[PDB]
């Protein structure tokens, strides 16, 4: 049972690391969306 719980906890740690990596990636992609939004907004304002 100790061995089983060790395997399960290591799997959950791996999944947690994957989830944190995904969170960081989603954050940086949201910053990309924000950057594009600002750039396009400024382009439309300058064209106007």
């Amino acid at each position: 049972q100790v061995e089983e719980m060790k395997t399960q906890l290591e799997e959950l740690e791996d999944e947690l690391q994957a989830a944190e990596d995904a969170k960081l990636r989603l954050e940086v992609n949201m910053q990309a969306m924000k950057s594009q939004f600002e750039r396009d907004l400024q382009a439309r304002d300058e064209q106007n």
Partner: protein
């Protein structure tokens, strides 16, 4: 931890398709007969122990599974070229592809975790540094991610 579980279907398919071209005897392993002959057919035939010293990266034998985990652990931390270009564009607000070496240095040598002077020099002696000390990160991300390359 088990790194293999991290990767995209497209990346796994790319590795599988590549491996299928190398696994010429179809035993599922990396072997002396196949990749050396393949590389000799594709280029200058470096069939010397330089290739054995590369095959010896795996613990003893080198199965497709071991190849996958090796390349997996090597790809751990890497991100899309567009996402990295976005991250650079946070400083290059005009999106010029022309960030200065002084700016790049300031962003790396003290701010956050410190890049060494050796790593900074590497970014000039391999990576696309240009006239007046402008740096073309749009080319950098292409060679870093091996996308469209």
């Amino acid at each position: 931890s088990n790194v293999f579980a991290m990767f995209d279907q497209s990346q796994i398919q790319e590795f599988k398709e590549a491996f299928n071209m190398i696994d010429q005897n179809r035993d599922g392993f990396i072997d002396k007969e196949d990749l050396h002959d393949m590389l000799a057919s594709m280029g200058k035939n470096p069939t010397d122990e330089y290739l054995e010293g590369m095959m010896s990266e795996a613990p003893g034998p080198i199965n497709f599974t071991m190849f996958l985990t090796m390349f997996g652990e090597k790809l751990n931390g890497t991100d899309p070229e567009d996402v990295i270009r976005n991250a650079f564009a946070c400083f290059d607000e005009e999106a010029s592809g022309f960030i200065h070496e002084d700016h790049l240095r300031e962003l790396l040598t003290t701010m956050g975790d410190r890049f060494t002077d050796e790593e900074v020099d590497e970014m000039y002696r391999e990576a696309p540094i240009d006239k007046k000390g402008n740096f073309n990160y749009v080319e950098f991300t292409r060679i870093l991610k091996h996308g469209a390359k």
